[PDB]
Design a protein around this motif. Structure first.
Motif, PDB file in Angstrom:
ATOM      1  N   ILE A  58     -55.714 -70.852   7.735  1.00  0.00           N
ATOM      2  CA  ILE A  58     -54.069 -70.306   6.958  1.00  0.00           C
ATOM      3  C   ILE A  58     -53.467 -71.881   6.913  1.00  0.00           C
ATOM      4  N   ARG A  59     -52.319 -71.912   6.135  1.00  0.00           N
ATOM      5  CA  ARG A  59     -51.248 -72.444   6.429  1.00  0.00           C
ATOM      6  C   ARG A  59     -50.201 -71.618   6.654  1.00  0.00           C
ATOM      7  N   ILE A  60     -49.586 -71.020   8.001  1.00  0.00           N
ATOM      8  CA  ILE A  60     -48.812 -70.816   8.354  1.00  0.00           C
ATOM      9  C   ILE A  60     -47.059 -71.317   7.422  1.00  0.00           C
ATOM     10  N   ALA A  61     -46.895 -71.879   6.665  1.00  0.00           N
ATOM     11  CA  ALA A  61     -45.882 -73.099   5.801  1.00  0.00           C
ATOM     12  C   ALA A  61     -44.353 -71.994   7.026  1.00  0.00           C
ATOM     13  N   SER A  62     -44.280 -71.872   6.339  1.00  0.00           N
ATOM     14  CA  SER A  62     -42.614 -71.491   6.814  1.00  0.00           C
ATOM     15  C   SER A  62     -42.088 -71.136   8.430  1.00  0.00           C
ATOM     16  N   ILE A  63     -43.216 -69.944   8.286  1.00  0.00           N
ATOM     17  CA  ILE A  63     -43.240 -69.509   9.570  1.00  0.00           C
ATOM     18  C   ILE A  63     -42.964 -70.905  10.852  1.00  0.00           C
ATOM     19  N   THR A  64     -44.236 -71.617  10.468  1.00  0.00           N
ATOM     20  CA  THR A  64     -43.032 -73.172  11.608  1.00  0.00           C
ATOM     21  C   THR A  64     -42.230 -73.409  12.179  1.00  0.00           C
ATOM     22  N   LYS A  65     -41.476 -72.761  11.872  1.00  0.00           N
ATOM     23  CA  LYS A  65     -39.843 -72.551  11.296  1.00  0.00           C
ATOM     24  C   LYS A  65     -39.386 -72.071  13.279  1.00  0.00           C
ATOM     25  N   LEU A  66     -40.806 -71.390  13.273  1.00  0.00           N
ATOM     26  CA  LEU A  66     -40.146 -70.540  14.777  1.00  0.00           C
ATOM     27  C   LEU A  66     -40.550 -70.994  15.736  1.00  0.00           C
ATOM     28  N   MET A  67     -41.393 -71.808  15.310  1.00  0.00           N
ATOM     29  CA  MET A  67     -42.438 -73.138  16.996  1.00  0.00           C
ATOM     30  C   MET A  67     -41.663 -74.204  16.496  1.00  0.00           C
ATOM     31  N   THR A  68     -40.936 -74.379  15.519  1.00  0.00           N
ATOM     32  CA  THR A  68     -39.744 -75.368  16.096  1.00  0.00           C
ATOM     33  C   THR A  68     -38.810 -74.881  16.964  1.00  0.00           C
ATOM     34  N   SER A  69     -38.343 -73.748  16.574  1.00  0.00           N
ATOM     35  CA  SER A  69     -37.204 -73.052  17.089  1.00  0.00           C
ATOM     36  C   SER A  69     -36.969 -73.238  19.272  1.00  0.00           C
ATOM     37  N   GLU A  70     -39.118 -72.582  18.965  1.00  0.00           N
ATOM     38  CA  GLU A  70     -39.318 -72.001  19.805  1.00  0.00           C
ATOM     39  C   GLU A  70     -39.005 -73.337  21.062  1.00  0.00           C
ATOM     40  N   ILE A  71     -39.560 -75.198  20.498  1.00  0.00           N
ATOM     41  CA  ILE A  71     -39.761 -75.688  21.292  1.00  0.00           C
ATOM     42  C   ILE A  71     -38.766 -76.255  21.496  1.00  0.00           C
ATOM     43  N   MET A  72     -37.028 -75.739  20.657  1.00  0.00           N
ATOM     44  CA  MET A  72     -35.855 -76.560  20.767  1.00  0.00           C
ATOM     45  C   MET A  72     -35.837 -75.947  22.243  1.00  0.00           C
ATOM     46  N   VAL A  73     -35.904 -74.408  22.070  1.00  0.00           N
ATOM     47  CA  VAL A  73     -34.815 -73.596  23.302  1.00  0.00           C
ATOM     48  C   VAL A  73     -35.868 -73.716  24.128  1.00  0.00           C
ATOM     49  N   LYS A  74     -37.284 -74.313  24.468  1.00  0.00           N
ATOM     50  CA  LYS A  74     -37.718 -74.866  25.998  1.00  0.00           C
ATOM     51  C   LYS A  74     -37.421 -76.472  25.835  1.00  0.00           C
ATOM     52  N   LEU A  75     -37.182 -76.574  25.775  1.00  0.00           N
ATOM     53  CA  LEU A  75     -36.091 -78.402  26.167  1.00  0.00           C
ATOM     54  C   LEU A  75     -34.845 -78.196  26.233  1.00  0.00           C
ATOM     55  N   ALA A  76     -34.216 -77.098  25.677  1.00  0.00           N
ATOM     56  CA  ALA A  76     -33.333 -76.678  25.670  1.00  0.00           C
ATOM     57  C   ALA A  76     -32.992 -76.200  27.701  1.00  0.00           C
ATOM     58  N   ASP A  77     -34.552 -74.886  28.307  1.00  0.00           N
ATOM     59  CA  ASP A  77     -34.276 -74.600  29.048  1.00  0.00           C
ATOM     60  C   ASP A  77     -34.353 -75.853  29.872  1.00  0.00           C
ATOM     61  N   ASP A  78     -35.339 -77.368  30.048  1.00  0.00           N
ATOM     62  CA  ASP A  78     -35.386 -77.591  30.712  1.00  0.00           C
ATOM     63  C   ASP A  78     -34.723 -79.266  30.735  1.00  0.00           C
ATOM     64  N   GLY A  79     -33.502 -78.973  30.277  1.00  0.00           N
ATOM     65  CA  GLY A  79     -32.458 -80.107  30.105  1.00  0.00           C
ATOM     66  C   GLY A  79     -31.917 -80.749  29.108  1.00  0.00           C
ATOM     67  N   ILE A  80     -33.772 -80.864  28.262  1.00  0.00           N
ATOM     68  CA  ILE A  80     -33.742 -82.244  27.301  1.00  0.00           C
ATOM     69  C   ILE A  80     -32.925 -82.577  26.505  1.00  0.00           C
ATOM     70  N   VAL A  81     -32.637 -81.199  25.351  1.00  0.00           N
ATOM     71  CA  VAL A  81     -31.587 -81.121  24.837  1.00  0.00           C
ATOM     72  C   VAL A  81     -30.110 -79.999  24.683  1.00  0.00           C
ATOM     73  N   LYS A  82     -29.493 -79.410  24.476  1.00  0.00           N
ATOM     74  CA  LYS A  82     -28.601 -79.200  24.567  1.00  0.00           C
ATOM     75  C   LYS A  82     -28.153 -78.279  22.484  1.00  0.00           C
ATOM     76  N   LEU A  83     -28.346 -76.955  22.358  1.00  0.00           N
ATOM     77  CA  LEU A  83     -28.115 -76.712  21.227  1.00  0.00           C
ATOM     78  C   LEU A  83     -27.134 -77.027  21.002  1.00  0.00           C
ATOM     79  N   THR A  84     -26.259 -77.232  20.679  1.00  0.00           N
ATOM     80  CA  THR A  84     -24.817 -77.881  20.473  1.00  0.00           C
ATOM     81  C   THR A  84     -25.062 -79.423  19.912  1.00  0.00           C
ATOM     82  N   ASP A  85     -25.859 -80.242  20.704  1.00  0.00           N
ATOM     83  CA  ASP A  85     -25.749 -81.816  20.445  1.00  0.00           C
ATOM     84  C   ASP A  85     -25.531 -82.069  19.240  1.00  0.00           C
ATOM     85  N   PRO A  86     -25.237 -82.313  18.839  1.00  0.00           N
ATOM     86  CA  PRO A  86     -24.770 -83.712  17.723  1.00  0.00           C
ATOM     87  C   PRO A  86     -26.192 -84.024  16.765  1.00  0.00           C
TER      88      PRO A  86
END
Length: 351
Positions: A58-86
């Protein structure tokens, strides 16, 4: 719900969602504490008389966004990005990222919550392009560098795919890995989601369901952040389960952070594109919260549509209940005829 009734309750709604939505084919996945209920209806291609299966693509289409955000959150926990980074922090060398004003740059959090001020899509693309193939990453950054941002960030919500693909670009840069590698390493491989991909094989493509408005099954890395992910009902069951406790499992460590809310509806001047499944009462990282109203419980959800697929995920995490549904469209298919039915099913399950 009580395990004695879970299947029966799902049966009160599943065929109605299937018929009312005018689906060609449908797969429904219901998780209620220890119970998993799966239903599939219709056909994988108009007139072929083959029922969808757990491993139908199937194409999950925009449900994709939840995994993009998951990745951001996991990288934030790793210290790789911050949510507040420009965003500019993760820009190619020497490439300008436009901002409303010097002191108010677009930050990763703004991209994730649709408050960045960016348009929904990059303007000026080709026509009749296969879904999830344009703009490419290079197209985006060539456009961005000459663009103008005329609303300050964090003041208006306006649903955006462009912003989410730029987010995926930034996450890829921060981690120093291609985005597909992040999706593999942070999400799909640890969970054994062996059919969840931006780069389907021929064997996988053969299994893609077909409805009205279908397009060819190909590489969708261009929409890595916003909408391109292919999956199956069984892969999506395993992903959704990580948000929900059962007798044998607790939610993944990052579940609460992934579902944190950042803007109440009243904290925003205006919202556009956020109300597809009902009024958005708060905006999270991709996730959208609807407060209890009428006969509906408080629900965390995300909608999606593309290439003839429509998708919806709705859950009540404190009750360990989640519902994922995917439908291939016919001509008369109306999205909320599918999503209203899921919400009502969720309402019955929480009783």
């Amino acid at each position: 719900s009580n395990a004695l009734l879970t299947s029966q309750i799902v049966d009160q709604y599943a065929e109605h969602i299937f018929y009312n939505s005018g689906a060609v084919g449908m797969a429904l996945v219901v998780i209620d504490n220890n119970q998993v209920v799966n239903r599939s209806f219709g056909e994988t291609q108009p007139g072929n008389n083959i029922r969808p299966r757990p491993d139908s693509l199937i194409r999950i289409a925009s449900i994709t966004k939840l995994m993009t955000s998951e990745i951001m959150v996991k990288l934030a926990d790793d210290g790789i990005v911050k949510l507040t980074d420009p965003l500019k922090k993760y820009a190619p060398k020497g490439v300008n990222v436009p901002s409303y004003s010097a002191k108010q740059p677009i930050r990763l959090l703004h991209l994730a919550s649709h408050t960045s001020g960016l348009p929904r899509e990059q303007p000026g693309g080709p026509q009749k392009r296969p879904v999830f193939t344009w703009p490419t990453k290079d197209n985006r950054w060539q456009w961005l560098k000459l663009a103008k941002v005329t609303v300050p960030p964090g003041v208006k919500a306006a649903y955006s795919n462009l912003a989410y693909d730029l987010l995926a670009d930034a996450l890829s840069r921060a981690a120093g890995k291609p985005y597909a590698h992040l999706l593999r390493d942070k999400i799909t491989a640890p969970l054994g989601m062996k059919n969840t991909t931006l780069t389907p094989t021929a064997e996988q493509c053969k299994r893609l369901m077909i409805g009205v408005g279908s397009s060819r099954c190909g590489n969708t890395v261009a929409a890595a952040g916003s909408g391109g992910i292919y999956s199956t009902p069984e892969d999506m069951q395993h992903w959704m389960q990580q948000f929900l406790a059962s007798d044998n499992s607790a939610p993944k460590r990052s579940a609460k952070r992934e579902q944190a809310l950042y803007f109440q509806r009243g904290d925003l001047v205006s919202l556009k594109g956020m109300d597809v499944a009902g009024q958005a009462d708060a905006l999270g990282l991709g996730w959208v919260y609807m407060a209890p109203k009428a006969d509906l419980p408080g629900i965390m959800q995300k909608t999606g549509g593309g290439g003839g697929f429509i998708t919806y995920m709705a859950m009540v995490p404190e009750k360990n209940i989640g519902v994922f549904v995917v439908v291939t469209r016919s001509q008369l298919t109306k999205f909320s005829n599918m999503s209203d039915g899921v919400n009502q099913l969720v309402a019955e399950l929480v009783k």
